[PDB]
């Protein structure tokens, strides 16, 4: 008895109905209501400048042609219905390439409640587009958008809103980070308006505030480079006649910054500016550069080429640009971490 | 209200042909463009083309949808473009393009009284080029996009920018990560063939590429490697492992320098001009350890058989050259 | 009456960066008024809202605040801002670039 009246408004429903054609063309603006449930966040492309991100997107508007009256006051229906009925084209703004996924049966909803007001949660996956300033490098953070509007519609069409309280409508899963190198803060939801050549059109907008973890670059890159400069400022320490043990030092830890140089720069987005790695390690490069060429000073000043004894003609005394360079190049060393790093952290 | 607007639509769409050209036998039908360039994803140096993301959008007068008695543009769900007309325009470019098509597929075809029907398209094409890199990475490159009809010659359809020289706007907008922007231009022609003339348009770009990050990390290191391997000068020949080790370490640091450039860079088969600086550095290196062989074997070899001249003179002789080597590029490739 | 105060840029392609207009009335409050984002977006302040128009000028690195309808309560130094909003577009912590601040006084 029930199904024989369900199939009945099923079938009574779309007589004379058009699709073609906006729910009161003439009427009023068309309010469409919106909630997004993130259930992950996914992996961030630095190299393409892109985020993934999966979203169930919650939709509702009021249509005044599919009243209806029976037993229940909700209906739920086919995506051959769904695909009969006016439905607001919600693209992205910044998508790259968008999947609607439809394993097995298409993963989309439309509820109708009696009075006409539909329900429509489609699950989608976004592959979206968030422009980087990586001046900043590794110790930045940076704001990431997902904005959305009607495509064919304008203000004087259509308007979009929110379901809830505006900050609290979108919901990002408590499991739903799916993050190494980054690390989600929070989200901020605000309403925008475009300008287009065809019209002003009403846009949406979810940002997602991202900040990078800097322990695998101090472990893989500062610390290296730290330490190889500590290794060329150490070599004063050995005597002004050895000259080829601190001339093979010398051009091996200049061997070994090239080395820490190009795999610092071979994960990284190559952008056309100065990252402050980059700072970082060409300022670290430079005094690796000129503790050789302080050796090189040191070696033009020798007269002799013998070692002094340990029990005592003539030696050598410890030169005096030695002794100046021992207490110069671990104080300009140390002023340039202590700029450094009170330069950047606090950006 | 609304029941006169369903049957607008209906007597427009009444016994319409979606075959028929607008003024079938008469004018050729004008179709003004519209470009709102979202971004360019990718210039891929390997594969010689650019991903283009944009809103094409064209305008033309079509007859048989001219209403009355409504004020309001009308305004269609996408699902009418597939009972209208619409031009067989394509992207000469074009390798793989396709229109967006989440949450439902990017069109828009919105109505006027007269006639005039615009025809939206969310498109990321990838558009190719033919790239002259002979100059990396001093280069300005010429990255177009064609557009032209398919069956239609211009004696039935012509293209012309909508609004001239403000057709094609947000490029001021689009901030590549290596590249710079310098000029677009807007080029309409009819061109002659022998089969019949066909309309094209032409969407073009100059992409200056940004020199100062090549600087930091490709020419920096090979000129302070270079510098390194002069330091042989300034000791004496009978040290004879530390100024081995100077120039061998330097060939091996330079070899590095080389190879991880070789793989760090876009691999592109032919002589460029980074790879010209980076071996005219290797051949300075490698000359700057045949000084010493030179010394070695006129001092300890042809002695029973001078080292200051040979060391004063390289010592004036390889700076002076190295600075005519970095005048010589810098003006020849700037 | 009507006005229009622009906020002209130098050092810096700012193409990518969200410019911005504020207000502070003597109180003490910045107050955010409009914004446009790289992808053309016009975000405003509540207060604001529809009374006036931001736009920018990407190529010659500018914004441009056109001002409709004037209160005597507009009376207020106007800061034009840039930053990359990070807790942004509402907060005065995330633009990281200031204008000068010019006074508009506007009475009955």
């Known amino acids: 008895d029930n199904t024989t009246v369900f199939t009945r408004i099923l079938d009574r429903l779309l007589d004379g109905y058009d699709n073609r054609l906006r729910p009161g063309l003439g009427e009023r603006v068309t309010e469409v209501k919106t909630d997004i449930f993130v259930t992950s966040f996914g992996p961030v492309s630095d190299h393409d400048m892109e985020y993934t991100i999966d979203v169930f997107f919650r939709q509702s508007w009021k249509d005044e042609r599919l009243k209806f009256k029976g037993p229940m006051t909700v209906l739920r229906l086919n995506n051959l219905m769904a695909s009969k009925i006016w439905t607001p084209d919600t693209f992205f703004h910044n998508g790259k390439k968008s999947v609607a996924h439809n394993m097995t049966m298409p993963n989309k909803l439309l509820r109708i409640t009696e009075d006409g007001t539909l329900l429509y949660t489609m699950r989608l996956t976004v592959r979206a587009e968030c422009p980087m300033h990586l001046e900043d490098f590794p110790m930045d953070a940076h704001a990431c958008p997902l904005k959305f509007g009607s495509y064919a519609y304008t203000r004087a069409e259509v308007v979009y809103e929110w379901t809830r309280e505006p900050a609290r409508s979108v919901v990002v899963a408590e499991d739903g980070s799916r993050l190494n190198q980054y690390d989600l803060l929070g989200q901020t939801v605000d309403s925008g308006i475009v300008q287009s050549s065809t019209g002003e059109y009403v846009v949406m907008t979810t940002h997602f505030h991202l900040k990078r973890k800097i322990g695998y670059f101090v472990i893989q890159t500062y610390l290296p480079c730290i330490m190889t400069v500590i290794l060329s400022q150490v070599s004063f320490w050995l005597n002004r006649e050895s000259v080829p043990a601190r001339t093979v030092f010398g051009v091996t830890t200049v061997l070994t910054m090239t080395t820490l140089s190009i795999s610092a720069r071979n994960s990284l987005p190559k952008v056309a500016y100065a990252t402050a790695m980059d700072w970082f390690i060409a300022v670290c490069y430079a005094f690796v550069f000129s503790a050789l060429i302080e050796f090189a000073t040191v070696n033009y000043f020798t007269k002799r080429g013998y070692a002094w004894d340990g029990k005592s003609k003539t030696f050598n005394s410890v030169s005096k640009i030695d002794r100046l360079s021992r207490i110069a190049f671990p104080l300009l060393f140390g002023i340039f971490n202590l700029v450094y790093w009170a330069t950047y952290l606090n950006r | 209200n609304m029941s006169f607007v369903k049957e607008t639509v209906d007597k427009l769409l009444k016994g319409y042909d979606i075959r028929l050209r607008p003024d079938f036998g008469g004018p050729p039908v004008c179709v003004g463009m519209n470009i709102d360039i979202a971004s360019i994803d990718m210039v891929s140096e390997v594969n010689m083309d650019y991903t283009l993301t944009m809103y094409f959008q064209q305008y033309w007068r079509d007859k048989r949808l001219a209403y009355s008695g409504i004020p309001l543009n009308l305004t269609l769900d996408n699902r009418v473009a597939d009972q209208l007309w619409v031009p067989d325009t394509y992207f000469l470019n074009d390798k793989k393009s396709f229109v967006h098509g989440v949450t439902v597929k990017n069109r828009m075809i919105r109505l006027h009284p007269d006639g005039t029907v615009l025809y939206g398209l969310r498109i990321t094409t990838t558009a190719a080029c033919m790239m002259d890199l002979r100059r990396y990475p001093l280069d300005e490159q010429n990255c177009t996009l064609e557009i032209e009809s398919y069956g239609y010659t211009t004696d039935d359809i012509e293209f012309y920018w909508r609004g001239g020289d403000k057709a094609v706007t947000g490029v001021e907008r689009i901030e590549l990560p290596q590249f710079s922007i310098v000029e677009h231009r807007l080029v309409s022609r009819n061109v002659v063939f022998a089969t019949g003339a066909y309309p094209r348009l032409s969407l073009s770009f100059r992409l200056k590429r940004n020199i100062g990050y090549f600087i930091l990390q490709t020419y920096m290191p090979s000129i302070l490697i270079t510098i390194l391997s002069w330091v042989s000068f300034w000791i004496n020949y009978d040290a004879s492992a530390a100024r081995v080790a100077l120039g061998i370490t330097t060939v091996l640091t330079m070899t590095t320098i080389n190879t991880h450039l070789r793989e760090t860079l876009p691999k592109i088969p032919y002589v460029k001009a980074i790879d010209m600086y980076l071996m005219g550095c290797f051949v300075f290196v490698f000359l700057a350890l045949l000084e010493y062989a030179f010394v070695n074997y006129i001092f300890f070899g042809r002695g029973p058989q001078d080292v200051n001249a040979i060391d004063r003179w390289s010592r004036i002789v390889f700076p002076f050259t190295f600075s005519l080597f970095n005048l010589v590029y810098w003006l020849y490739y700037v | 009456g009507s006005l229009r105060v622009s906020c002209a840029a130098s050092?810096?392609?700012?193409?990518?960066?969200?410019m911005a207009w504020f207000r502070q009335a003597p109180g003490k409050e910045r107050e955010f008024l409009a914004a446009?984002?790289?992808?053309?977006?016009?975000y405003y302040g509540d207060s604001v809202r529809g009374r006036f128009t931001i736009s920018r000028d990407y190529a010659k690195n500018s914004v441009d605040l056109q001002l409709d309808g004037l209160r005597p309560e507009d009376t207020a130094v106007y800061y034009c801002?840039?930053?990359?909003?990070?807790?942004?577009?509402?907060?005065?912590?995330?633009?990281?670039?200031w204008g000068q601040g010019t006074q508009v006084t506007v009475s009955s």
């Open positions: 050092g810096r392609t700012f193409t990518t960066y969200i």
């Open positions: 801002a840039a930053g990359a909003g990070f807790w942004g577009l509402r907060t005065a912590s995330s633009y990281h670039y």
């Open positions: 446009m984002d790289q992808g053309r977006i016009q």
